[PDB]
Structures are given as C-alpha cells and as structure tokens.
Amino acid sequence: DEFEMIKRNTSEIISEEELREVLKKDEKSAHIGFEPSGKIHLGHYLQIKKMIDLQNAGFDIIISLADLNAYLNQKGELDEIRKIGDYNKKVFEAMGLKAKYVYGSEFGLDKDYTLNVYRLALKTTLKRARRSMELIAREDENPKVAEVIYPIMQVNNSHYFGSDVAVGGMEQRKIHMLARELLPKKVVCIHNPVLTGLDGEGKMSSSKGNFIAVDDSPEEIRAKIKKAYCPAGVVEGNPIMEIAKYFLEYPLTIKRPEKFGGDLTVNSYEELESLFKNKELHPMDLKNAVAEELIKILEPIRKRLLEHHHHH
Amino acid sequence: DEFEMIKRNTSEIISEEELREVLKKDEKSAHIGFEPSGKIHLGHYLQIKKMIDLQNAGFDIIISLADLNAYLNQKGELDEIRKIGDYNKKVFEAMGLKAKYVYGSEFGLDKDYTLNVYRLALKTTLKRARRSMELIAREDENPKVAEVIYPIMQVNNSHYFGSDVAVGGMEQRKIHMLARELLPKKVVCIHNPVLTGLDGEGKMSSSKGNFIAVDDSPEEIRAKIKKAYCPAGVVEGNPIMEIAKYFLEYPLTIKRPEKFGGDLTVNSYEELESLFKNKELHPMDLKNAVAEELIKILEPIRKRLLEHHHHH
C-alpha cells in the first residue's frame, strides 16, 4: 500500500519496478533540493507533502537547500541566498516535515566533491547538459558556462547523498535522467506535477499575484484567488481546480446563497470536477470555497511561523 | 634593454606598453603552466628559455604543473598525470631554470579557489569558452562540459598566482585574452611561437619522430633530424631552420667535404637563411650541422638528468 500512497498525485516514477525493490529495504532514503526562494508557495508545498508521504513510508528525508546551485543559476550573491535558505528551512519545518536540512555549500566545495564535479564534466556532453537546463535555466541572451555546470552539480549532490529516491518537479526529469546515466547507483526518481500559476500563464512563481504563499495572510489569499484565471467550465490549466485537486480535503461543502442553489456537498475532487465542467458550479463559488479552505489548510503553517517570528 | 631581451623571439606581447610599466617595479613575477607531458621537447625548451630571460630581468618565476587542467583535457587519471609532472619538474630544473614549481591540484581544489571558478563561470559565455579552446581541446566528436571548465580554470590559476606576466604559446592567446577581461588585475601576456614538428605537419608533439626531446640520446637526435621535413631552399615551415633560428649559437661553422664547398662559416641565423634560400647550403649539410649542434646544446640537460636518474 505504501507504493500507492507514494504514487498518489505524482506525474511519473522512474521506475515503479525499482521503487518496489526500494520499499523492500529496512532503511531507505529520499532527498529533494530547492533553490532558496523568497516565497514558499503551493508548488513547494506540493513537493513537501510528497516528502512527508515518503517519510510516513519509512524513508529518511534529506532537504537540500541548494544555495550553490541557486548561485550558479544567477539567484544573487551566495551570502544572501543562504539567508533565504535559512527562512525556507523554517517554512518546511512549519509544514510538518521532520527531516535533515543540508546546505549545498556545506559539502559542495569540499575537495573530493569538486573532483567528482570535474570527473562528471569529462563524461557529460555539452549538448546533454544544455538540453537538461531547458526548463530550468534563467533565460539569457548570452548563455554562460555556469549553465552547464549546474546540472552536473545537481547530479553530484545526488551522488553525495547516496539516496535511494530523488524527488522533484517534472522540469527536473532531464537532470534526473542524466543522474541515472552518470552515477554508479541509479536513483529512483519521483516527479511531481508542475502547478499552474494563478495568472494562468505557466508555472506558479513568485511574480506578483501568481502564487499563494503558505504564509500569506487571509486577505492576500482571498484577493489572489479572486482574480486568478478560472474560466467557467474549464478544468485544464485552471489553477483553482488544481488547488482543489491537490490541497483540499473531501468531503467539503461549498457555501452558496439560496438563489444559486444553496450549500453544495461535494464528496470528492471528481464530483467537484463534474460540477464545474457541467457549469453547475460557478467560478465565483468555486473561488470563494477554495480561498476559505486554503486559509484553513494553511493556518497552522502561518501560526507556527508567526510564533517563531516573534522569537517566542 | 631588458625589454628587448624579453621580447627577443616572442610572437607578441599584450601589451608592450604594459610590459614596460611592469619592468619599473622593484619586484615582478611571471608564470607559465604546462600540462604534464611524457616528452619534454624543443617546444617546451623554447618557452623555458623565455622564462629564464624573465628571471634574468629580475622576475620571480612560477612554473605551474597544470595537472588539474590536463585532467580536464583528457590526459588520463589524476595520479598518473602528477607522476609525469614530477618528471617534468626535474627536466625544467635540468634546463637551468631556478623557479618555484606548483601543482594545480595543490591549490586548485581549495574551497575559495573553486568558488571563484563558479564566479568566473557566471561571467564567461559558452561561446567564448569554446572558441578559446579551439587550438587546445583534444579533438572530440561529442564535446564534453570539461572543455569549457578548462579555460576558466586556467584563468583562475592566473588570478591565484597574481603574476604581472603570463607566458605561453600562441595557441593560448584566446585564454589569455579572456583572463585580461575576467580578472581585476590585467596580466601582461607574452606569447612564444609554435614550433613546427619534425614531420612538417603542424606543431611539435610527442608523436613518433615528430619531436626532439631534450633528453633524447645522440643517435635519436641524428636519426630524427635526418628524416625531418626539410626541402631544399624552403625556410617557411621548415623545422630544421626553426631549430637553427631558436636554439643554435652563432657564429658556427658547418662541416662539409671538399667537393661540396668545404667548411662554411656562418655569422648568424640570417646568413644561414641566405645560404639555404639561395641553395648554397644543401639540406643534408644543414641537417648534419643542426643535429651535431643540438647534441652539444642539449648534452648538459641530458647528463644532469642522467646523474639524477642513477639516484647519485
């Protein structure tokens, strides 16, 4: 059953047969890396929920605050990136994840680590390195050598951790394929879906109004949900429906006035989907319910962080 | 006068005006790096002679046994490259060069060094990195990421040494141009000509018969000179004439039998050139003289190394 609980809401597992062999082990390990981000949003939360699934399946979890990778991906100076990392650690802990948190710079400048970067550089074609960064590399009119060092560094992190399982978004799949080719131990890769941003124009990100941050205030959640892309009857690419799929708890009741059908009890996401596609559920009522539900879902994260922020 | 003695037999100085300012300093420093090579040949010797010129001008000399660079340029395993480095050091010392010898791996895996590799990677375009390796990169049908790390590592070595002057062959000129753009202190670059191989097909190299090694035996020098490319009256691209230009001492007498003109006293390389172009000097006599002169020029290097090799 652990296999299906791990598989739930994933986009792919490379490969399922290898995962089942991993689940036979007495001790098993998984890791994920994040470039430190000033906002920790529902996209991050989706992946942390998967790490919690792995933890509940008996995995030891490592969270890599990949500040050296963010440095190579033009995220600023190294000292400021690590200060954002410190904050990210606090947010992940506030989410219920007990894990080991490691900074990429704590090990990623060691002599033996660096020597393996260069060894991997001897085996990785430029063509493969650049193709692996297509969905990852900060767009750039004059591409820099840092762009092809990045994927080898991410591969080397996997080698350093020695994990059975590497977790990430679907955009990581080419780097993970490189890791399965370059390293003696093939990591089992679990890929999570990429969440659509609130704007309805590509992935969720820190751009203004495009995200729900896990520590957003209730009025911010309502305002950003209210103006999100959400056409009537449209489910594909609809970020409000994706949030309902991946974060809400069912059954739930959608509160409606009497003229529009009154309260509506929804047994599951699939019933919610049926009602939205058939236009029995109006976008305005869908948004109100998703906002109020999200507020309740995220409240413990918010109040946990707020009590820390008072240093008390 | 030191300026002209340094300039003698160089291909270019970037720039001469900057060199003259360097010569005003009380203390001045120059370095050169070599990928360790199993044969140390006249091409190496030409560059060491230039380092000796700099030494006699009051420069402190650093010789970098660039084993980490050779590693990235597919020269084999790191341990075997450093054993060739050890031998190269002994040869350079046997040439009369008193200097400091440093292995690239002694400093080139330090945390602060590696961090500057990554900083430089952020500033170097892939296009510039690859173009700088055109004359340097081991030919490869599937170019590897190591190819673009190499030039940034060579630039970073220059930064680590802090030298006023960087010396190398003309093939290094693009990497040196990158160093002048990437580093806070602009190094003055002195480029030596590329010696034609004995085969007459490109640069001198370790391929069979294509080189005179400084520790070659007299019968090896005679045999390899005798079969070298050397068409009558042809000076351009003629490796025997280049050796006469760059290594022989003038005046010299060329021994000839009586039928062919008897002994011929040559006041300078320019007189030797006049006689060869006008076909007054036959290739056979030119080769005999260059071989016997080279034997005498290289003898001290040979006997110095041989006395070491007996461990006594």
What are the structure tokens assigned to A245, written together? 């799929």
Characterize A121-133 residue by residue with b for buried, 16 or more Cβ atoms within 10 angstroms of its Cβ, and e for exposed. bbebbbebbbebb
- For A230-281, the DSSP string reads --TT--TT-HHHHHHHHT--SSEEE---TTTTS-EEE-SHHHHHHHHHTTSS
β-pair type (B188-192, B252-254): unpaired
Find the CB nearest B121 among A110, A125, A144.
A144
Find the CB nearest A148 among B74, B114, B145.
B145
Find the CB nearest B144 among A110, A122, A146.
A122
Q: Which of A120, A130, A144, A153 should we substitute to test contact with B (largest number of B Cβ atoms within 10 Å)? A: A144
What are the structure tokens assigned to A237, written together? 């690419």
- Do residues B160 and B24 lie in contact, with contact meaning Cβ atoms separated by under 8 Å? no
What are the structure tokens assigned to B107, written together? 């400093």
Dist CA A158 CA A177 (whole Å): 12
Dist CA B97 CA B167 (whole Å): 15
- What's the angle, vertex CA A165, arms to CA A162 and CA A171, rounded to 5? 115
Dist CA A69 CA A65 (whole Å): 9
CA terminus-to-terminus distance, chain A: 41
- Do residues B153 and B161 lie in contact, with contact meaning Cβ atoms separated by under 8 Å? no
What residues contact residue B21 under an 8 Å CB cut-off, 6+ apart?
none
Please judge whether A126 and B147 are an interchain contact, meaning their C-beta atoms are less than 8 angstroms apart.
yes
From chain B, the residues in CB contact with A66 under 8 A are none
Taking alpha carbons only, the member of B237, B212, B215, B242 closest to residue B227 is B212
Q: Which amino acid is at B191?
A: H
Taking alpha carbons only, the member of B90, B83, B126, B122 closest to residue B105 is B83
From chain B, the residues in CB contact with A78 under 8 A are 115
Please judge whether B121 and A72 are an interchain contact, meaning their C-beta atoms are less than 8 angstroms apart.
yes
Distance from CA of B126 to the nearest CA of A (A): 5
- Looking at residue B269, what DSSP letter applies? H
- What's the angle, vertex CA A207, arms to CA A201 and CA A211, rounded to 5? 75
SS3 string, B143-205, reads CECHHHHHHHHHHHHHHHHCCCEEEEEHHHHHHHHHHHHHCCCCCEEEEECCCECCCCCCECC
Please judge whether B126 and A147 are an interchain contact, meaning their C-beta atoms are less than 8 angstroms apart.
yes
What residues contact residue B26 under an 8 Å CB cut-off, 6+ apart?
none
How many other CB atoms sit within 10 Å of the CB of residue A100?
A: 12
Beta bridge partners of A169: A192
What residues contact residue A209 under an 8 Å CB cut-off, 6+ apart?
A198, A199, A224, A227
- Do residues B298 and B224 lie in contact, with contact meaning Cβ atoms separated by under 8 Å? no
β-pair type (B28-34, B59-65): parallel
Q: Which amino acid is at B116?
A: N
List the single residue in B with minimal CA-CA distance to A73: B122
SS3 content of chain B, % helix, strand, coil (to 5): 50, 15, 35
Distance from CA of B104 to the nearest CA of A (A): 12
Dist CA A82 CA A67 (whole Å): 6
- Do residues A29 and A162 lie in contact, with contact meaning Cβ atoms separated by under 8 Å? yes
In a 3-state reduction of DSSP, which class is residue B60? strand
What residues contact residue A110 under an 8 Å CB cut-off, 6+ apart?
B111
CA atoms within 13 A on the CB side of B129: 30
List the single residue in B with minimal CA-CA distance to A113: B109
Give yes or no for a cis peptide into B251 (omega within 30° of 0): yes
Question: For this experimental structure, what is the resolution in angstroms?
Answer: 1.7
